[PDB]
């Protein structure tokens, strides 16, 4: 659950 890339 790492922040997704834009």
């Amino acid at each position, epitope marked *: *659950d*790492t*922040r*997704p*890339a*834009p």
Partner: antibody
Amino acid sequence: VKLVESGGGLVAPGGSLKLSCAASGFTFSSYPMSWVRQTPEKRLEWVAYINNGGGNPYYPDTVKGRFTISRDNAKNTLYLQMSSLKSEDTAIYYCIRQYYGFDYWGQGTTLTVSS
Amino acid sequence: DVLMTQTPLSLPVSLGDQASISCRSSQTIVHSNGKIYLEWYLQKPGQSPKLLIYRVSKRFSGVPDRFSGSGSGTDFTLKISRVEAEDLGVYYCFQGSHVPWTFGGGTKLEIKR
């Protein structure tokens, strides 16, 4: 994990300035990196993203077209090239190792856009 | 953009008492993948911000057990159960679900003594 920013200082409006960040304590090429600035009003604004490979450089429209994020995975260094500098850009700029979120922050380097 | 509005602006609290900080977004912040990327940061005086919570309620490594996150929809809440003096500073909420990623304006935690 240590992140050290450099290159801050005074710049005339419309001018240009590039920041550096020295990364250590981890595999630099494995992680995506971001820049976040804090205005004198102590407002936080994300200003740039780049993935672990040096790709997908992403910016908000407030700085898009003027700022350029990059990295030298050989030298463990993250860069922020600025140009056409406005007074609104005056802020402390933080170098960040991103994974879950903004997991690790540098101590910052200050930009001042003033005549 | 997603507007993040924090409540209150300042929060005086005695040691051992509880502190609660609210964050409200201008829209739902569920990513295309179905997850909410709401994060809480603390900036202690003279320091860089520090990540406390990510994914609404997940503690980042090193963050004590007394920091709790919750919420969904547009309302999100950071709770501090037994305030210590080292907890003073400014708390920022943040959404990483929609670009541009945006911060809240901050809530200052003040220790009553």
